[PDB]
Amino acid sequence: VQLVESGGGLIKPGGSLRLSCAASGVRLSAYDMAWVRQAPGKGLEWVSAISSSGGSTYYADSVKGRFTISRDNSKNTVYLQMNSLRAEDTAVYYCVTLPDLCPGDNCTYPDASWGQGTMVTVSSG
Amino acid sequence: QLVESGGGLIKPGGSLRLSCAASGVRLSAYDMAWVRQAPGKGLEWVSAISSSGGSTYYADSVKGRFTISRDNSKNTVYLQMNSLRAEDTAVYYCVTLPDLCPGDNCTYPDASWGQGTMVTVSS
């Protein structure tokens, strides 16, 4: 399984960007997916997550209302729409799968994975 | 905040048991996991455990060598690492796994990430 994020870059405060993550080697539908970020000088922080079906989602309070996570399993891609960006949203964004838990070693789930990350810089002047 | 301990220096082939405790967060109510980042490498999943502790996950590189467990009476989570080698040297983070809301307005507490602790496999 391999995750590759794209859409990162430089944008002015107030802007909107859509990050995407394509999975290869395993159908994306097998995974509940999530976005994690790490701002300069800060620890890692959960941003958003979405179930394999797309019916359940998670959002950190810091981005609630401005960010929307979605997915297109047919394209094996997950997205993170980021609106009304702020300087504090500057960080490396990672797309990751969420572990599938098993009662004992009796499952045949595909392995979990982490993307390489993509930088998002919200600045001006 | 989540705080990891029990790391540090360990000789090759040795064992360490990492612990994670938290202040302002009730760990027993969350599925938990361990993530690591070796020098010059990207972050990667290590292991995970259900809130009840009945279900688990292990990355291929550590399965059979590591054991994740938890004590919900002390609200702590552990990761016993055995047969440690150079590739296991890394910063280890304990994290809660996000609660997914089937719609909007659920009342789950926010997810959190530990600060991480260094594990150095050296003689």
Numbering used by the authors:
A (entry chain A): 4 to 128
B (entry chain B): 5 to 127
Publication passage describing the model:
To our knowledge, Gr6 is the first sdAb derived from human VH with this characteristics and the solved crystal structure of Gr6 presented here is the first structure of human sdAb with a dimeric conformation. The monomer structure of Gr6 has the same fold as the canonical immunoglobulin variable domain, consisting of two β -sheets with five and four strands. The total buried ASA at the interface of approximately 2200 Å2 is contributed from both monomers of ∼ 1100 Å2. The interactions between monomers are predominantly by hydrophobic contacts involving residues Val37, Leu45, Trp47, Ala50, Tyr58, Tyr91, Val93, Leu95, Pro96, Leu98, Ala101 and Trp103. Polar interaction in the interface includes 9 direct hydrogen bonds. No salt bridges and water molecules are found throughout the interface. Among those residues, Val37, Leu45, Trp47, Ala50, Trp103 are the hall mark residues situated at the VH-VL heterodimer interface of the immunologlobulin variable domain. The other four residues that contribute to the Gr6 dimerization, Leu95, Pro96, Leu98 and Ala101 positioned on CDR3 loop are unique to Gr6. This suggests that these residues play essential roles in Gr6 dimer formation and replacement of these residues in Gr3 (Leu95-Pro, Pro96-Glu, Leu98-Gln, Ala101-Arg) disrupts the inter-domain interaction. In this work, the Gr6 crystal structure shows that the VH-VH interface mimics the classical association of VH-VL dimer, strongly suggesting that Gr6 is a strict dimer and that the structure does represent the dimerization in solution.
